[PDB]
């Protein structure tokens, strides 16, 4: 009913997890906890080691002629379940399974990246590119032993964030540009309806223009850009538009011009874009566009992995442009965290 379960061969090394998605609050991440039932008669001297790892699998959609391991671990922890207070779920699992139930738990440190999967190109291959978290349990006399997967159970977990309860002030920004006569030229006021938007929710932007110059504007260009700030060995900012709208509206050489534009980012029209940041895949499935990474006020440290943010950019091709930053995120479930049984096309 409640807890997930997975097993691995004769070792009976069945690992139990109460949830697959662990929500992250900007200064406290939900503790990982679980139970790993095992058969001591089979383990004998071998110790039951469980490990949590966050791994960035970097470009191996490029470099296929070098197919090897293109990964770095961002975080690792290990716990010797078989030689911390037990949670209620852990207590219930121990009571149910009995003597051979040995619990485990990990504290994920704050400011690690959330589970984000970079989208494949055509001819997609391999587990993922991007950041994923994994729990595995295995039997060995030492953690340095070479595991051969015979008696190892591996589960992929996700670290996720949900939209904060209180939205901030509506994103408002403006830019002013002057040329030639420069008497009182264009100022480009732009304002979003709100700062926080949910996946599939339209993005509404209000824009104002005052074209008091001899040259007019031919088009009004509105688009939502995903700014995936990547970091591993070097740091980079990839701009991949997720919603784009072109308006042929023109501003006369006059004082005022008003209009409101609505956009809605979705994954159907952005599948072909290789490298687009997507919410971490729990398996070989499909997930929505990556949620904004919320950051604490301490420092936007070059933090490893992918940090995702969104801005809508409004441009006037007389060009005058201004960006409105916003948060694209799921609301807090108020229920069980996982996908809630999205139909499977068996």
């Amino acid at each position: 009913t409640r807890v997930f379960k997975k097993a691995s061969c004769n070792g009976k090394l069945t690992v139990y997890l109460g949830k697959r998605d662990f929500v992250d609050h900007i200064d406290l991440v939900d503790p990982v906890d679980g139970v790993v039932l095992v058969d001591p008669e089979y383990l004998k001297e071998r110790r039951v080691y469980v490990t949590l790892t966050c791994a960035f699998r970097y470009g191996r959609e490029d470099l296929d002629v070098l197919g090897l391991t293109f990964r770095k671990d961002l975080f690792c922890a290990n716990v010797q379940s078989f030689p911390k207070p037990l949670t209620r779920l852990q207590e219930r699992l121990i009571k149910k399974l009995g003597e051979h139930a040995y619990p485990f738990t990990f504290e994920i440190p704050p400011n690690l990246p959330c589970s984000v999967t970079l989208q494949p190109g055509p001819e997609d291959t391999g587990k993922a590119c991007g950041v994923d978290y994994e729990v595995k349990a295995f039997c060995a006399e030492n953690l340095e032993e070479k595991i051969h997967k015979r008696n190892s159970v591996r589960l992929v977990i996700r670290k996720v964030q949900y939209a904060p309860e209180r939205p901030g002030p509506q994103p408002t920004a403006e830019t002013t540009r002057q040329f030639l006569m420069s008497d009182k030229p264009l100022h480009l006021e732009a304002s979003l309806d709100k700062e926080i938007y949910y996946h599939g929710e339209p993005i509404s932007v209000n824009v104002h223009v005052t074209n008091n110059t001899n040259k007019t504007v031919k088009k009004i260009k509105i688009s939502v850009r995903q700014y995936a700030d990547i970091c591993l060995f070097n740091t980079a900012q990839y701009k991949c538009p997720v919603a784009m709208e072109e308006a042929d509206d023109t501003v006369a050489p006059s004082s005022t011009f008003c209009k409101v534009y609505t956009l809605t980012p979705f994954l159907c029209n952005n599948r072909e874009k290789r490298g687009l940041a997507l919410d971490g895949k729990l398996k070989h499935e499909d997930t929505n566009l990556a949620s904004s990474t919320l950051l604490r006020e301490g420092a936007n440290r070059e933090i490893l992995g992918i940090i995702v943010s969104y801005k809508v950019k409004v441009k006037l091709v007389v060009d005058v442009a201004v960006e409105l930053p916003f948060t694209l995120m799921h609301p807090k479930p108020k229920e069980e965290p996982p996908h809630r049984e999205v139909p499977e096309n068996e």
Partner: antibody
Amino acid sequence: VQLVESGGGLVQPGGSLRLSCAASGFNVYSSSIHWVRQAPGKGLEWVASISSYYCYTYYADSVKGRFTISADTSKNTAYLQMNSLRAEDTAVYYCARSRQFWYSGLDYWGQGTLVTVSS
Amino acid sequence: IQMTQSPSSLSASVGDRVTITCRASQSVSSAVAWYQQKPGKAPKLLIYSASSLYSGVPSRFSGSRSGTDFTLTISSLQPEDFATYYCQQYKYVPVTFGQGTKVEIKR
């Protein structure tokens, strides 16, 4: 949130019919639209559904290849195309929606439109 | 997947406790929902996830799961509780509805 439906009528076997359900109070990309059968004196039966966010399209075995479901995001409405209507297609069709990501069952149902096929 | 509701037709009275039950051909996890449909009206969602009451539904309705078997309990009946209740599993694209169970006024 209201799902008003139109297109019900009387048709003969082998004909085609159009069902339109205007969507109000919810977004197509943030919701998944479904169509459900109910034959006279029988239970419910799913026939087709669409998820605009992932632009999926699913149909029942008795409906696969015969009907087609499309959604108009600009007009905020969903259309079901019916072809090669047969005698057993006679049923009341309801348009229902569900949250696009966290399904959580079919929350809102529109007033069904009666579709009858006979010679 | 096939979902068979054991009671094809049920009879009860106001204030009585009614427990509708259903069973699936194979495990469908907690992805089971229950609907209420008055004659001549569209179905109304009662419970989703086989244990979560839909917002605005009376608190008397309650859902339960036992393996492949799912149970709906109406608790203290009311005059508005006499209708047809349908189950549904949505773990797989081929969503299957139950045969339906009618609640009859008993005298």
